[PDB]
Design goal:
Helix content is about 10%, strand content about 40%. By secondary structure, the chain is mainly beta. The structure holds copper (II) ion (CU) (4 copies). The PDB classes it as metal binding protein.
Amino acid sequence: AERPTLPIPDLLTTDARNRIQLTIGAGQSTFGGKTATTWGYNGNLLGPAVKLQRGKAVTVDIYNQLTEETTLHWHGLEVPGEVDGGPQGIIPPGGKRSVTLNVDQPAATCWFHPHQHGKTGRQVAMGLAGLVVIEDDEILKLMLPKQWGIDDVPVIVQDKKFSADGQIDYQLDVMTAAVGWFGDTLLTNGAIYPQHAAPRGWLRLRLLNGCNARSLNFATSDNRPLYVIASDGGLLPEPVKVSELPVLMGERFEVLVEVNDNKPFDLVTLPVSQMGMAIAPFDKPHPVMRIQPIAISASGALPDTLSSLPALPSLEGLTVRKLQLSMDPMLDMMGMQMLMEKYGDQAMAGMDHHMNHGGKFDFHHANKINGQAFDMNKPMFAAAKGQYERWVISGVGDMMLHPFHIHGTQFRILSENGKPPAAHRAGWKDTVKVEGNVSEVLVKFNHDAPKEHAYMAHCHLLEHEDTGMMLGFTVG
Ligand SMILES: [Cu+2]
Ligand SMILES: [Cu+2]
Ligand SMILES: [Cu+2]
Ligand SMILES: [Cu+2]
């Protein structure tokens, strides 16, 4: 049979009352011909792309039609804590919450997802994620590929696994609390190995790693390069040519790739050096989508310059914050042992060369920052507003992968896991790799966040977050 076409999320803008309506609900999807219960925003799975303009406010009405509580966070958007949608931003089942977003950051591809306390991994795994397209006056002048669903397309890449009855097989247990929830099936905007018909010339892909725990590494099947034009928080100063593009959980990159007549190619993901993630079929390059060239000229450009990136400022005298990530050694050892017993040596491929003892020993609070599993009631510190700070995040002490995300900002990486950042990671980022080593970022918070609606800082390996690897902080 033919490949399904790549689903394209609807690009949503405000009504005359300046409102966007998002309904959160459950329905059915089909994978490999089997029905599964799934959750979506304005539909059964995944979500729309909300279009925002810098300097304009919009109001979002969010209707929770689930039978459990949820929250809605705008990952990558710089907004006050009151509308950030972290764990404190509860929307009761059957209820509605509205937020007004005053967009004040450069053009970028952001996304939105639940942030329910202790349950974010399950709610994302069940289907909830959407996109945010921010535009500003600067990016349209570049004449990039811009026809949504034709030469400008979002690519949300996620793994799942399913039980024999067809349902999503999600569990937060001792194994996944240590190494993450991952599966054997790869979805691309919700579809298994779709094709996308693209015109001849440049194709813009807005890539999102929407996996709970799996890192990805994009490349093309015939080794044509990818031209990175933007990261999490917006355009790079100029395109950066790469042959492969690692993408951590929750990160976005936009790339341009050439489309030539008569030569279809796949976007693929290459095996990564992360525990658990190279089990067949991920032990080999895995297709993500087929690009099918169409003999119609694409009008988009790849300009030599994209934007102006300001210099880093002097670092002397800035507040330095230490964030020590950690995992309880016993539950790290027990979850890694369960991974190895289940899959054997292949669970470490590509890597470098039972009774109840009480609540003190519960894996649900085994992962921590600065010695503390996430306490919704006690922000760990008060950060300055309108001030640059240097945050130092260490994963020394274990070897798991921790893509560390800070709400309320787009930062600059100074050191990524002990090395200067790669050029395409040197611009605006909301995520930094921490793995066995130390990262340092330069952050500034432009908006307030009070104790009652604090900003989160956390590992974006969702099962780590849900079992304590998160802190709250206030601003202002
Ligand atoms: Cu976020
Ligand atoms: Cu996030
Ligand atoms: Cu982590
Ligand atoms: Cu978050």
